[PDB]
Amino acid sequence: MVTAKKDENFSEWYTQAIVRSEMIEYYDISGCYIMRPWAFHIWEKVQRFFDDEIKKMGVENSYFPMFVSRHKLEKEKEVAWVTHYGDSPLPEKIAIRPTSETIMYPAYAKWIRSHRDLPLKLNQWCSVVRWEFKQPTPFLRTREFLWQEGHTAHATEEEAWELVLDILELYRRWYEECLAVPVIKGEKSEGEKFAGGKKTTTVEAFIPENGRGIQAATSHLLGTNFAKMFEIEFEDEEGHKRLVHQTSWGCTTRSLGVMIMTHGDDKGLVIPPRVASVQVVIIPILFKDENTGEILGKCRELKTMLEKADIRVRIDDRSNYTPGWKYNHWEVKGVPLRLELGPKDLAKGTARVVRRDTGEAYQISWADLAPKLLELMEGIQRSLFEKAKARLHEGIEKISTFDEVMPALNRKHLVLAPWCEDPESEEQIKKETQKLSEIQAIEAGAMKTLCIPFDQPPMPEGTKCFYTGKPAKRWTLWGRSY
Amino acid sequence: MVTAKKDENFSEWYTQAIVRSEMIEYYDISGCYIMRPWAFHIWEKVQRFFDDEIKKMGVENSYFPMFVSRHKLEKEKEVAWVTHYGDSPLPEKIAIRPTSETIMYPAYAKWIRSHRDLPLKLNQWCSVVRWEFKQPTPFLRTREFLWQEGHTAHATEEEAWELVLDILELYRRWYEECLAVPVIKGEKSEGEKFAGGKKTTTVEAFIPENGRGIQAATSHLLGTNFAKMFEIEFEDEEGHKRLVHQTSWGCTTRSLGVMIMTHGDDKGLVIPPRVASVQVVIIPILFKDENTGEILGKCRELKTMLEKADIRVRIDDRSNYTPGWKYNHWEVKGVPLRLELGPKDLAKGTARVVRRDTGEAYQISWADLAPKLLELMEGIQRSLFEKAKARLHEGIEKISTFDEVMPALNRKHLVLAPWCEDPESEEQIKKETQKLSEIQAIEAGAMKTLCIPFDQPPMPEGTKCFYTGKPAKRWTLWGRSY
Ligand SMILES: Cc1cc(N2CC[C@@](CO)(C3CC3)C2=O)cc(C(=O)NCc2cc(F)cc(-c3cnn(C)c3)c2)n1
Ligand SMILES: Cc1cc(N2CC[C@@](CO)(C3CC3)C2=O)cc(C(=O)NCc2cc(F)cc(-c3cnn(C)c3)c2)n1
Ligand code: PRO
Ligand code: PRO
Ligand SMILES: O=S([O-])[O-]
Ligand SMILES: O=S([O-])[O-]
Ligand SMILES: [Cl-]
Ligand SMILES: [Cl-]
Ligand SMILES: [Cl-]
Ligand SMILES: [Cl-]
Ligand SMILES: [Cl-]
Ligand SMILES: [Cl-]
Ligand SMILES: [Cl-]
Ligand SMILES: [Cl-]
Ligand SMILES: [Cl-]
Ligand SMILES: [Cl-]
Ligand SMILES: [Cl-]
Ligand SMILES: [Cl-]
Ligand SMILES: [Cl-]
Ligand SMILES: [Cl-]
Ligand SMILES: [Cl-]
Ligand SMILES: [Cl-]
Ligand SMILES: [Cl-]
Ligand SMILES: [Cl-]
Ligand SMILES: [Cl-]
Ligand SMILES: [Cl-]
Ligand SMILES: [Cl-]
Ligand SMILES: [Cl-]
Ligand code: NA
Ligand code: NA
């Protein structure tokens, strides 16, 4: 049973919800967590979705080593260094991948010779290690995390860019379609883009309870920069060697954290039906003074009937726990639909169904069960999305000048402001908002750009930048961030 | 095009077959290889097979960290040690997992409380690192390898043992059913079993060209030994705490290497149809003086028709390569069936189909194509298995005394001998066969137990051990090994 309230101590609530639902286990090496099956099933589901999608684009899976030489890694210049095999020292220390550009792109340079070798599209599912000495957050910021990283190479910048955008659309569907989390597509500022890339696009999500934006996933136009560092060139049909144009793109188990925080409530997790490993839990009522065999046999029949409609069903027929215990047990784990069946329902040929998001209950004839539940699941999914979408739009203030920033941040909101996109102005804004935040804390940090949204509201003609007074260039989404 | 002959220089042949088919790429850190998509597709296929199978047994996937503390790892006492994060030294060095017993079993000890928590069945797909200073072999012996490792805990030894055996049967199907490689189920000797386990079972495969057995996969009865080291105990319904009985079991991309060596020929790879990512390659003949649009449209029709029968088809319609080039290109990559379509076939409403294993050609009406190809693929699969099975049984000599050992080993054969199973005798046999091998080499190493087969031939009553003269206990399979 969860006891911390989501709107009071968000940290403790989140810890309780992910521990008591058996999603996370702690580990003696700080910054790493055990991902138990209840969470891993959701990861498997979104991984299957995305893997199918990119296979339709011709992307193929592969596996590159987890180690990279100091030489290949410093060819492009929080990295963990292997230095010893038990007793023996290594002749040269090797790094564990924080990302695989420097591991893969030498191979790319060998494999790409002609324009007929392009496009080259590879992906891998693995973990990477980014070893920060700061305190971790389960799912959101961990020292090891599972991800996928795709890396493509094209004959033209425009083809590479169209791919960047197609992948960003897949990430939007990953979050919005599967996880029911609303996100904002945008471009990262020059100061925040991937090191060595040309243009970094992102989908951004929002955590209302602490007011923070989080980078949900990233799709980079690398252009020819990595091609120059690794000499990845192809021949046209005329014989002139030309640099390939590259992309890389990544998304991680951070997505699970974002789903939990988005949909959970004071009773615990709420899993969108499209990724719940158990969509319907069947709880028979098991009075001592009843035909228990009949009740359980009807539960098995209903399970078969629902699974023919591709509904994922579990029966909890344990005699040693009361139905109230089971109600709370599966609410904590976030199963979206609970189906109750006792002697009265049997005599009436109906079932009682309770939805996890609102607690609304329905009485459904057995004949109508599968089509009704299907409808109900799509209604839960959509409702989880729309409410989250509402909380997103309520969390964003459109402003015009800088003294509107601090009030908006004290309301745990993001700000959408006309910006000149000068990089020096961004670092000045970060340091001033941090100092203003510290001074406020004394009476009881920093705001950064999150993204330059693709969906730009109207820009009146003479509009000026909210911090420098110079001509505004575009609306930019700022806030505190993970 | 492959140029080394499989029966002459096996090493060079194997290197050519896996490089020229685009399965492997080399890497600047010795002992690690890049797994390119042509190989990774096969890994994905066998992973899907095994994952589905163990999900039917109630095993669930998870993910534990790749790091383990020195303390937890030396709790049970080729390990790579992380000692630094860039500049900063680690307070205590951490190891990269060579296996995950010491990572997972503390969590098990926390999670298991009551008999109602058992059985606990977890699996993970990841890589591990076993850092030997010896020279690697692609797929077979690498310093990093992808695998799966499953770890279960049960209330009784007999339940754990039945699980060990069920998994070993899945490994037999992994090799024999999917990869068409024949294997021998057996028990490992006391000297060769998993450190700290009670009984190690294995499936063993055989490489005729060098005479070597290889441990294809492993399923361990751990018993209560790890339960004692990690204090994993459960309460019965009476309240007495009792040690759980455990298993662990593993299988790796070594399986791909074994498939390559088993089925390949002088032209390159031969991929069993059940794991070929391309089962049928359609090669249109494209004379300049023909209706090319018609020919290609019929190839697309045939592709659609075959894929409705769940056949995996690729069309190679590249105009810049001759059909002879394409024939060799897809033979090298081991596609099992090639389908040729030109103007004459079109006018006759037939197609020409050539099978990769024997080169036999067929003329098939379009209407019969899908059922005929299905039949053909099952005939290739079975034939690849049966011939490999024949080469296995020809590679094993049943012997009765020790001076039959060296002749049998010089024929690149394994030996099946009555053994007393004394462990000291095994190490004596290893050292004597090694010395005999070295002395023979001078005129131009060691034989170990491979397994004690489940399928025991008859044991005449007074039979004596082939090395010590004492009463034989069981027939044991010995040979040189990887
Ligand atoms: C799960 C995850 C995802 C991503 N990222 C980054 C890339 C991206 C973005 O979309 C996606 C792959 C492309 C993503 O998901 C980055 C990290 C991460 O930086 N981990 C290290 C770490 C450990 C730690 F204990 C503490 C902190 C820490 C504490 N305070 N601060 C400011 C940091 C950081 N972790
Ligand atoms: C792919 C793979 C599989 C397995 N194993 C072991 C377990 C098993 C068996 O079934 C399965 C998981 C349970 C399996 O597949 C073990 C290795 C391995 O020992 N790697 C290290 C290494 C690297 C290296 F460069 C050279 C050598 C080397 C050279 N000479 N010698 C005598 C060794 C060894 N590698
Ligand atoms: O780490 C990143 O952000 C990029 C995208 C995935 C691979 N490298
Ligand atoms: O390494 C091994 O042999 C066992 C089985 C997989 C996990 N540990
Ligand atoms: O465990 S998988 O996602 O690499
Ligand atoms: O790449 S997967 O097999 O962990
Ligand atoms: Cl938090
Ligand atoms: Cl999987
Ligand atoms: Cl652009
Ligand atoms: Cl949507
Ligand atoms: Cl970034
Ligand atoms: Cl249950
Ligand atoms: Cl209760
Ligand atoms: Cl009821
Ligand atoms: Cl509720
Ligand atoms: Cl755009
Ligand atoms: Cl917006
Ligand atoms: Cl070899
Ligand atoms: Cl996959
Ligand atoms: Cl036994
Ligand atoms: Cl078989
Ligand atoms: Cl072993
Ligand atoms: Cl092709
Ligand atoms: Cl040729
Ligand atoms: Cl022909
Ligand atoms: Cl042939
Ligand atoms: Cl047995
Ligand atoms: Cl045998
Ligand atoms: Na303006
Ligand atoms: Na005997």
Closest C-alpha to B218, from B256, B260, B178, B174: B174
Cα separation, A260 vs A43, whole angstroms? 13
Whether residue A454 lies within 8 A of chain B, CB to CB, comes out as no
State the resolution, in angstroms.
Answer: 2.0
Q: Which residues contact B62 (CB under 8 A, 6 or more apart)?
A: A34, A35, A36, A37, A40, B122, B123, B124
A449, A192 Cβ separation under 8 angstroms:
yes
Cα separation, B217 vs B192, whole angstroms? 14
Cα separation, A236 vs A257, whole angstroms? 46
Closest alpha carbon within chain B to A121: B37
Residues in chain B: 482
Handedness of CA B305, B306, B310, B313 (dihedral sign): negative
Look at the domain B1-272 and name its fold: BirA Bifunctional Protein; domain 2 (3.30.930)
Cα separation, A429 vs A445, whole angstroms? 12
User: Rounded to 5 degrees, what are φ and ψ at B206?
Assistant: -135, 135
**Residue listed under structure tokens 């066998």:** B46
Tally Cβ neighbours within 10 Å of residue B463.
Answer: 14
Cα separation, A207 vs A219, whole angstroms? 21
Tell me whether the omega of the peptide bond preceding residue A119 falls within 30 degrees of 0, making it cis.
yes
Rounded to the nearest whole angstrom, what is the distance from the C-alpha of residue B288 to the centroid of ligand 24?
18
List the residue whose alpha carbon is closest to atom 8 of ligand 4. Answer: B99
Beta strands A414-419 and A396-398, pairing class: parallel
Q: Which residues contact A143 (CB under 8 A, 6 or more apart)?
A: A30, A31, A32, A129, A130, A131, A132, A136
Cα separation, B96 vs B128, whole angstroms? 8
List the residue whose alpha carbon is closest to atom 6 of ligand 4. Answer: B250
List the residue whose alpha carbon is closest to atom 1 of ligand 3. Answer: A99
**Residue listed under structure tokens 């730009």:** A456
Residues A326-336 as b/e (b if ≥16 CB within 10 A, e otherwise) read bbbbbbbbbbb
DSSP secondary structure string, A264-311?
-BTTB----TTT-S-SEEEEE---SSS-HHHHHHHHHHHHHHHHTTT-
Whether residue A58 lies within 8 A of chain B, CB to CB, comes out as no
Q: Which two tokens stand for residue B251?
A: 């299988």
- Each domain of chain B, given as residue ranges in start order, spans 1-272, 273-378, 396-481
Cα separation, A66 vs B146, whole angstroms? 11
B253, B42 Cβ separation under 8 angstroms:
no
Cα separation, B73 vs B95, whole angstroms? 8
A85, A92 Cβ separation under 8 angstroms:
no
Q: What is the 3-state secondary structure (H, E, C) of chain B?
A: CCCCCCCCCHHHHHHHHHHHCCCEECCCCCCCCEECHHHHHHHHHHHHHHHHHHHHCCCEECECCCEEEHHHHCCCCCCEEEEEECCEEEEEEEEECCCCHHHHHHHHHHHCCEHHHCCEEEEEEEEEECCCCCCCECCCECCEEEEEEEEEEECCHHHHHHHHHHHHHHHHHHHHHHCCCCCEEEECCCCCCCCCCCEEEEEEEEECCCCEEEEEEEEEEEECHHHHHHCCEEECCCCCEEECEEEEEEEECHHHHHHHHHHCECCECCCCCCCCCCCEEEEECCCCCCCHHHHHHHHHHHHHHHHCCCCCEEECCCCCCCHHHHHHHHHHCCCCEEEEECHHHHHHCEEEEEECCCCCEEEEEHHHHHHHHHHHHHHHHHHHHHHHHHHHHHCEEECCCHHHHHHHHHCCCEEEEEECCCHHHHHHHHHHHHHHHHHHHHHCCCCEEEEEECCCCCCCCCCECCCCCCECCEEEEEECEC
Contact A71 B28 (CB under 8 A): yes
Handedness of CA A344, A346, A347, A349 (dihedral sign): positive
Helix axes A254-263, A37-56, angle to 10 degrees: 110
**Residue listed under structure tokens 């079975």:** B382
Closest C-alpha to B332, from B412, B388, B265: B265
Q: Is the CB of A194 under 6 A from ligand 3?
A: yes
Whether residue A41 lies within 8 A of chain B, CB to CB, comes out as yes
Selected residue of B48, B69, B78, B81 to mutate for chain A interface (largest A Cβ count, 10 A) = B81
For A:198-227, CB contacts with B below 8 A are: none
Tally Cβ neighbours within 10 Å of residue B202.
Answer: 25
Alpha-carbon dihedral of residues B228, B245, B79, B107, nearest 10 degrees? -80
Whether residue A19 lies within 8 A of chain B, CB to CB, comes out as no
For residue A377, give the 3-state DSSP assignment: helix
Atom of ligand 1 nearest to the CA of A217: 10
Q: Fill in the amino acid letter for B276.
A: A
How far is the CA of A375 from the CAs of A178, A286, B185, B444, in angstroms? Answer: 16, 29, 50, 77
Q: Which two tokens stand for residue A241?
A: 């060697």
Q: Fill in the amino acid letter for A311.
A: I
Strand-by-strand arrangement of the A350-355 sheet: A313-315, A280-284, A337-341, A350-355, A361-365
For B:139-168, CB contacts with A below 8 A are: 144, 146
Q: Fill in the amino acid letter for A95.
A: A
DSSP 8-state symbol, A244: -
Cα separation, B279 vs B300, whole angstroms? 16
As a CATH number, domain A396-481 is 3.30.110.30
Contact A79 B85 (CB under 8 A): yes
User: Rounded to 5 degrees, what are φ and ψ at B166?
Assistant: -60, -40
Q: Is the CB of A99 under 6 A from ligand 3?
A: yes
Chain mean position to CA B236 = 39
Cα separation, A346 vs A282, whole angstroms? 14
Tally Cβ neighbours within 10 Å of residue A453.
Answer: 18
Cα separation, B33 vs B38, whole angstroms? 14
Tally Cβ neighbours within 10 Å of residue A405.
Answer: 22
A150, A252 Cβ separation under 8 angstroms:
no
Whether residue A116 lies within 8 A of chain B, CB to CB, comes out as yes
Rounded to the nearest whole angstrom, what is the distance from the C-alpha of residue B325 to the centroid of ligand 24?
4
Q: Fill in the amino acid letter for B89.
A: P
A125, A113 Cβ separation under 8 angstroms:
no
DSSP 8-state symbol, A177: I
∠ CA(B367), CA(B369), CA(B374), 5° rounding? Answer: 135
Provide the CB-side half-sphere exposure for A86 (13 A, CA).
10
Provide the CB-side half-sphere exposure for B378 (13 A, CA).
5
Contact B34 A71 (CB under 8 A): no
Atom of ligand 1 nearest to the CA of A249: 13
Chain breaks in chain B (C to N over 2.5 A) after: 77, 444
Cα separation, B187 vs B193, whole angstroms? 8
Look at the domain A273-378 and name its fold: Rossmann fold (3.40.50)
Tally Cβ neighbours within 10 Å of residue A71.
Answer: 10
Percentages helix, strand, coil for chain A, rounded to the nearest 5?
35, 30, 35
Tally Cβ neighbours within 10 Å of residue B65.
Answer: 24
User: Rounded to 5 degrees, what are φ and ψ at A133?
Assistant: -80, 0
User: Rounded to 5 degrees, what are φ and ψ at A208?
Assistant: -60, -40
